Scaffold this active site. Sequence first.
Site, PDB file in Angstrom:
ATOM      1  N   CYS A  42      20.784  58.768  43.321  1.00 48.94           N
ATOM      2  CA  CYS A  42      22.274  58.829  43.168  1.00 48.94           C
ATOM      3  C   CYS A  42      22.749  59.295  41.782  1.00 48.94           C
ATOM      4  CB  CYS A  42      22.917  57.470  43.405  1.00 48.94           C
ATOM      5  SG  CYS A  42      22.403  56.201  42.220  1.00 48.94           S
TER       6      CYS A  42
ATOM      7  N   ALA B 231      22.032  56.901  38.933  1.00 49.22           N
ATOM      8  CA  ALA B 231      20.659  57.070  38.399  1.00 49.22           C
ATOM      9  C   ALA B 231      20.630  58.237  37.402  1.00 49.22           C
ATOM     10  CB  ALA B 231      19.683  57.293  39.526  1.00 49.22           C
TER      11      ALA B 231
ATOM     12  N   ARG C 190      12.058  53.346  34.042  1.00 51.76           N
ATOM     13  CA  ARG C 190      11.760  54.659  33.421  1.00 51.76           C
ATOM     14  C   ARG C 190      11.194  54.396  32.027  1.00 51.76           C
ATOM     15  NH1 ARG C 190      15.469  58.438  30.979  1.00 51.76           N
ATOM     16  NH2 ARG C 190      15.095  60.614  31.565  1.00 51.76           N
TER      17      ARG C 190
ATOM     18  N   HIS D 107      24.180  63.608  35.576  1.00 50.91           N
ATOM     19  CA  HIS D 107      23.949  64.256  34.255  1.00 50.91           C
ATOM     20  C   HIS D 107      25.259  64.882  33.773  1.00 50.91           C
ATOM     21  CE1 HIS D 107      19.975  63.565  35.535  1.00 50.91           C
ATOM     22  NE2 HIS D 107      19.637  64.796  35.922  1.00 50.91           N
TER      23      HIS D 107
HETATM   24  S1  CLF Z   1      24.125  54.996  45.315  1.00 48.60           S
HETATM   25 FE1  CLF Z   1      23.645  54.496  43.136  1.00 48.60          FE
HETATM   26  S2  CLF Z   1      22.169  52.792  43.364  1.00 48.60           S
HETATM   27 FE2  CLF Z   1      23.318  52.850  45.330  1.00 48.60          FE
HETATM   28  S3  CLF Z   1      25.128  51.163  45.214  1.00 48.60           S
HETATM   29 FE3  CLF Z   1      25.701  53.420  44.722  1.00 48.60          FE
HETATM   30  S4  CLF Z   1      25.630  53.542  42.420  1.00 48.60           S
HETATM   31 FE4  CLF Z   1      24.245  51.866  43.142  1.00 48.60          FE
HETATM   32 FE5  CLF Z   1      23.735  49.253  44.217  1.00 48.60          FE
HETATM   33  S5  CLF Z   1      24.396  46.935  44.597  1.00 48.60           S
HETATM   34 FE6  CLF Z   1      22.764  47.485  46.134  1.00 48.60          FE
HETATM   35  S6  CLF Z   1      21.734  49.282  45.163  1.00 48.60           S
HETATM   36 FE7  CLF Z   1      23.445  50.128  46.479  1.00 48.60          FE
HETATM   37  S7  CLF Z   1      23.877  48.426  47.936  1.00 48.60           S
HETATM   38 FE8  CLF Z   1      25.295  48.786  46.147  1.00 48.60          FE
END
Ligand code: CLF
EC number: 1.18.6.1
Lengths: 522, 522, 477, 477
Positions: free
Chosen positions: D59, D62, D93, D192
């Site tokens: 995402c 990230a 990371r 980014h």
């Molecule tokens: S695409 Fe990226 S990692 Fe996903 S939520 Fe969205 S910013 Fe985060 Fe987060 S707490 Fe759990 S891992 Fe998601 S269901 Fe929400």
Amino acid sequence: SQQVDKIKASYPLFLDQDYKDMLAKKRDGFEEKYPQDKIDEVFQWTTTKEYQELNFQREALTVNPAKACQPLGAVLCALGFEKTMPYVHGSQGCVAYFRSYFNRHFREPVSCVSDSMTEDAAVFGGQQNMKDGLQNCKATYKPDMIAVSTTCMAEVIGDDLNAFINNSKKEGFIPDEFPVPFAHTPSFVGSHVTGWDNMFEGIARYFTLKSMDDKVVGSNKKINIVPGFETYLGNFRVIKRMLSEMGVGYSLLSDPEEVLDTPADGQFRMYAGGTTQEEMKDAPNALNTVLLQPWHLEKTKKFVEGTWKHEVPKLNIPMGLDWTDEFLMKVSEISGQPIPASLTKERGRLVDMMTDSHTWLHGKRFALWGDPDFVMGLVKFLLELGCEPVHILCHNGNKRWKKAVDAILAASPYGKNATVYIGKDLWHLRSLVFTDKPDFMIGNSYGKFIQRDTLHKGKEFEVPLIRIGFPIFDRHHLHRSTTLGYEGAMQILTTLVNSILERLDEETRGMQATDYNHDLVR
Amino acid sequence: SQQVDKIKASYPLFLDQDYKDMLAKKRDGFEEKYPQDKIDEVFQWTTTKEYQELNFQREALTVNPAKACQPLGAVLCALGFEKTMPYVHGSQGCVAYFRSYFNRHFREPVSCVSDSMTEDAAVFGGQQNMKDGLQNCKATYKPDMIAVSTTCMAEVIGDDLNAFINNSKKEGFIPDEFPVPFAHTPSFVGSHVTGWDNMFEGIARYFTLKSMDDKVVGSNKKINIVPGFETYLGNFRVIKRMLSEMGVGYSLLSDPEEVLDTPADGQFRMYAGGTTQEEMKDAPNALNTVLLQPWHLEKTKKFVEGTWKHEVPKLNIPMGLDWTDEFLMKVSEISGQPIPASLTKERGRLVDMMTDSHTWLHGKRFALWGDPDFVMGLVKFLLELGCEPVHILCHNGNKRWKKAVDAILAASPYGKNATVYIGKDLWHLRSLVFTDKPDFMIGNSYGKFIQRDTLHKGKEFEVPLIRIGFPIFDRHHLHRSTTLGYEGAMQILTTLVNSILERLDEETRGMQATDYNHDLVR
Amino acid sequence: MSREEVESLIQEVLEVYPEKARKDRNKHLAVNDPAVTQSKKCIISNKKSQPGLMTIRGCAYAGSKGVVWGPIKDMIHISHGPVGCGQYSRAGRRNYYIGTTGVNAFVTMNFTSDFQEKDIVFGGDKKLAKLIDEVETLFPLNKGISVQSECPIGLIGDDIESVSKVKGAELSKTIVPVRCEGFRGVSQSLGHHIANDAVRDWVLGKRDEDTTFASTPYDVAIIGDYNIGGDAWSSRILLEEMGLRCVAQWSGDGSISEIELTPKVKLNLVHCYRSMNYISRHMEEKYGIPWMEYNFFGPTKTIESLRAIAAKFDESIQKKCEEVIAKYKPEWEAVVAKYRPRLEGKRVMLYIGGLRPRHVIGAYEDLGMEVVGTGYEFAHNDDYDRTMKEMGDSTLLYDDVTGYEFEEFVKRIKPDLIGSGIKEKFIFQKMGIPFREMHSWDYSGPYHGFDGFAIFARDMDMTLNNPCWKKLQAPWE
Amino acid sequence: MSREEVESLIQEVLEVYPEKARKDRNKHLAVNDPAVTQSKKCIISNKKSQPGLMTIRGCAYAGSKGVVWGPIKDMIHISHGPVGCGQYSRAGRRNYYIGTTGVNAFVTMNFTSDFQEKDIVFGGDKKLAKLIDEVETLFPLNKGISVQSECPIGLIGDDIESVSKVKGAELSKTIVPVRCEGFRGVSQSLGHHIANDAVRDWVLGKRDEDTTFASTPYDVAIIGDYNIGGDAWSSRILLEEMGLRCVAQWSGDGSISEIELTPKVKLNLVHCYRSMNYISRHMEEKYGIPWMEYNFFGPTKTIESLRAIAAKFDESIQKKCEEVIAKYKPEWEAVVAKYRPRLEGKRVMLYIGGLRPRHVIGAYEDLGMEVVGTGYEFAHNDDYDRTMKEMGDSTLLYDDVTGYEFEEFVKRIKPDLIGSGIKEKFIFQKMGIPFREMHSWDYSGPYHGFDGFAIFARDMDMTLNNPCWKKLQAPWE
Ligand code: CLF
Ligand code: ICS
Ligand code: CLF
Ligand SMILES: [Fe+3]
Ligand SMILES: [Fe+3]
């Protein structure tokens, strides 16, 4: 002084300054101790290559040996038979030492008796002690069988066990049908594994030599398994589990797992489990006999091939991937049972753990010691993992075994830097790990002192010890582990990789100094 | 510089002086770093009681949490059914993180899919993503079942899963007979164990709610077992082994042991094992249902009692001695099968190990954290051993669970110094282990940083970490361990006593300083 | 108190034996009477162990090498013979020492001849000489060598005395031959005797002509304390707090120079009478040094011993002794206040070997605990003479007890706690009875003095009151 | 080779898909032609992932929090939203750094607002302000705060910009709001972009009016290196050996003051074009600072890069550059001599997210290894333009590869070695193909520079030649 809410025992009560001042006055006033600079210089000298040359020129002096004497192995073998009292003809101090040694390693009661030989016996022999001992032991302890081994004093005076036991039977001290197998077990010759071999051969001879006429090879559709001197309960358990999974009829011989693992339920059980006398009597009717540790079962091999007419296979100890595979294939070929899918999956899971940890295991340098079969199995497994055995020591090894290990090392690119030592002790190994430092030691508890010595040279010179083998006094319940088969390989691999990772975390725990490499994920 | 014959990794290549000089120049020239004296002063301040008071006054900020979000637990639950693809409806970044997290802990392939909702879906909903995703997943990976969970973005926009899946079925994207159970799993509410509970209840409802008419309780002569969120393979395996030993018919539900332990034989198996759809359909015909981790299976309990009409027993997690005894007795009472002698002997052997190591275990002080059921089982076992749990933390615990743990602590004299914390994180625990130092920590890999911090205060303040729980990224193959039953108690006891002994050897390894207490035998 | 019941139990337990063994063992089992002063009229000791009865006793090599000579830190002790003996005894006894192991101290190391059949057939004297040369090469900071004989050395015709003499003069190094073959005697006690004889004959008189050590009127030597878990260090501090100067301690944390300095002291304090009474009497006859026995187990015995020892000296030492007692009184009083109610009324049965079973009774009594059973593996009649006054009426006394006998006695008496060695521990833990190792202190040093008492009380409480003892019976049975 | 075979394999693999998915997927697979310099006519990238296809892609959060903002040590990065996001990305990371964690550095820590139901229903602006206050209380040595938004922030209409402005001025503390919600974009690459925009708007111009930093003609800034396993440190030393001065380092081991210092530097050395070209172009337009791309993977590329970089300055820098090259020539030549014979002829398939699938090809070729397939998770068409000339003819190219697609390609091509992310590794280890983790270097020390190449060669040798790969087939089967 003591604080009642936080009482301190010897460590670190001595660390309190009143005690330090006392010890300083004692040393300075009456110990006439060498100056600390001289001590430091001598220690540094003992870590050098010149000292190692002098050390390896030793011929008469042995320092910190890595073996025991024959009657200990004889007692362990005797403990593997049902309702059997280990009986040691000779001096009682030996039995006190044997019982205490085994008691510390397994955290379990070890039952053995002695005829308490005396200076008067040294000139008249031990026959009166034998007759009284056999009568007394049978009356008070009620054993089904009495297995007789010998102390060095009995061997030196030349007591004839067969004549003594026969005279006890003709006298009526013990019944003529009561089974009393015996074996001569001299401490000066071989080591404890030799004693195990001698005791087992004596028992097998006693139960089979005079009744071979009616024996037909292969009639009971079983395979005999002889374990040798084994101090891991898990090894007995895994061998039984693998054979039962294949649906292979088997008759384990000298198995003590039940006696050395009795539960704590409010009663003391002096006897539990063990090979029955009927199993030993019917052993020559098996399809074949497998020796799990052939390098200290040579006399047993000669008896089993010469008398039982079994074609004993040339098998290595089933340690690691290839040798477990070969053992299973040989068992399948002898019995006619295919290898089942559960064992195939277990082997695959071990291979998965190998691929998972290979990056951390590759190229690590190990010194190691122990008994011959265990040492060679461990070397084979280490080569399979991409590790480098550097110093291989077997105090009770011989030249033929050394040739076999050298051949194994030559078959792999990871054995190029290995040297095999026989007849060397742990002081030799201390010199070896100082002058050619490996990454880890693998061995028994006596290695801890070596580790301490290396830490004294410096933290960058410390060689951590990994406890695999016999005996393991400092650690608790490691005697429950397994080293044979895929399960044993899995346990050993986990132990090794996590020792490597624990050392790495120790080295990278320094805040703002080395903790840049203190990674969460490894 | 590098020496080709001895290549160095980041530790200790950075330790080399050229790199040290570079880093010193970088810091002095362009980082505008606070003076080291100010750094030391602030660190010392953060180890104080005043800092602890400020830290425990936190209301909005969470630092280093000890929990995860619901869809991770939902995915783990879905993985326990045969040929089932976990589908998470929402943003794909979540699925990448879930797969990475699980992959590191088990060192195994984890299969999950997303429908990749973007901002357009945030405006008009996810129904087009649902239809195309279900079609694509069924065509490509060929599952027998698709279990749908929800990311936070889908929960915020209020996507109606039931309507979406029904519309997909009525427009021919997937067949009407194809099983698509679903559950709403909001990240904001509860934690990952809540997601496991929601997913399981969704699956059970999907397979049983509309077919209860022909169901008779107890007709299939089995007991249903629900494991909850479990990251140890050995726990599934020991439950199955103990039930089979008693000769008790059982139907494990949501078991993933096979798919998380596939062998490495040259082929990739995306699916393996798992609860079958027939088992779930026939579950209401069981004698009763046992929940192994009742404190995060409350919704499942409500469904099973309300709909299946099973009288779910009030059982604690089968951890330690007493709770394993109670679990076995309840199973025996439900099924009518007596407890066999093998389990009696196993219990006795655990008691034997307890009596063997009690002197080293007695009075040791532990901080510990994890999920509610695991934490309470570990606290119970620690009390049984004569140990002192001092700091008990459960970030995802509630008030009723806290009363249950307080009642458990009050039942023993060893719980007098214990405090239970719910809703606290690992920064709180760092303050606790600084101001009230225990002997060891028990928890997951995130504790290693705390250990590092304490070592920075001094060697006499360092609190070693013992890795039990989820996740364990740094160690390899600890996920194969067992924590349930007598086997799990034995493993945990061995781990604890040998951690104590290894620390003691570390503290007494200094020659002529502390090595007077460096004993061979412990 | 049920004296007839104890006598009946002894008879029923003896019923199992054959006639000769029963007649022998009946003399080694007695019901205690405090009034009786001569113990020979009820119990027989220091006799040969019956064959095949699973005795607990060791050998003379254990008594000499393991007990007396081994603790001497700056000497190298060669186990002369096959490999087994030294390997089983390597670092199995916790005699605490301060030093650099392998450089100036050698306690935890195993030096051995490693005899082989050639050495048995043709002898090991030349091998012993070559070994001594190798020792001098590799361990240059050793201050002496002892050669402890194992069973073959006596059985074959070795003469280690001549080798010791020849090598000693050539290297200017003290070499002490010890004829401690395991088949001599009936137990470890003959090993003690042999070791003390070797000490007087080869070490003790080196400085008879030397007068360069400066002596004070307050010079004492601790004899018979082996520093188990630093037990001697806990005792020495008290002596130095009383104003005395401890020139030597035999033999825990001991050095050869301390042994050589011992004949210059004013008083000999012998903690273990059985191990060291031989050399104590020798020093009294030869040097005019008085010796007295003392006891530092528990506050009562410690205070009594300190007062008597101070009474041997002038008034300054007595004033210092009252200061030490006053300083330590609150600490052991707090120990009693915290641990006495938890262990009050509890009954103990102890089998510990030569000195400990009588010695530790006062500490158990200080905690309100009653010692129903006392037993010795290798004591002599004088030890039982001291034991009968210490022991209460109608309690069981037992010498060289067998495994069967002790198990039956424990089943009948049903003690709350048993204190014994490593070969009885697991047997009685499986029986459900709390057990304390009374040789190694279950790896929890020290039990001596005021600091020792606090560890003792904590250990007894932690084992007797432990939760697991309530869990040996499964709920379903 | 066999372009027609590779095209046929792409068609057979595509046969499984439904019609919509297959038509989109075919545009993302191609057969390489080095002569072709416009990859748009050949392959399509930077488009949305098809649903249900098990995409590797991360995402936008990230891309921003995990990649760009997380490495800087001084700043505290608040994951704003529910607990999951920051927990899964905590210390996953290996962006290495020097500091005292929890006091002046906060890289491996997880700070989050941890939303509950009421935060979703009512909003989290007051919670964010209170959180910022608590952060200032408990971490006084932090030098700035960033707020990384998760999915609910964007979906519930929270205004973090106003909170940042109000709290920033009141505390005199830099507070950077980042709208990096995961639902934005199609991959980490959009994150980014957002992170670079936030750097431009809130941090970069704080010293535009400041002229108290002393600048030299040899001032450079390393842009786009995240110090993975100390990769930037391996690169910086070489730059320092060439005579240049490295003012700033974005963003591995980076500090906020270094970011502010970057406008002063004469030249920008960009390693990761994909993540940092945005700010590099901004600085060229705003400050007149030139920027150039370089490559320190393997000896050939690093020598070329060092010469090109030195060509931007005067003759003394070129002399020092030749000196550095001459100094390091024997070491990497020895590495080649040792490891190329073990790796010559082997074929590699590399899937990673951006830059590295083309950056590491030269290092593989330096060991005689052939890259036969490569692909990106989230690269744009310019990355493929730079990639097509660096790959051999008729090799496989692939963008946003599905898990099924990659598995089938590997089965057909049968590479000797695969470089990919953690999710891929367990699947290929099961199939018996050696796997190297490109993203984390398999937890190994740095692959950058001459020092890095030695570790790279050793790592590739050990996985490819490891004995276990010969053991997946049981002998009986
Ligand atoms: S695409 Fe990226 S990692 Fe996903 S939520 Fe969205 S910013 Fe985060 Fe987060 S707490 Fe759990 S891992 Fe998601 S269901 Fe929400
Ligand atoms: S020497 Fe003796 S058996 Fe007096 S051989 Fe034995 S360290 Fe015992 S009762 Mo082990 S006469 Fe010492 C003894 Fe007592 S070894 Fe220790 S505890 S006080
Ligand atoms: S009573 Fe005592 S311990 Fe026994 S031998 Fe004799 S001196 Fe020694 Fe030694 S090597 Fe083994 S343990 Fe013996 S059989 Fe010989
Ligand atoms: Fe035990
Ligand atoms: Fe795996």
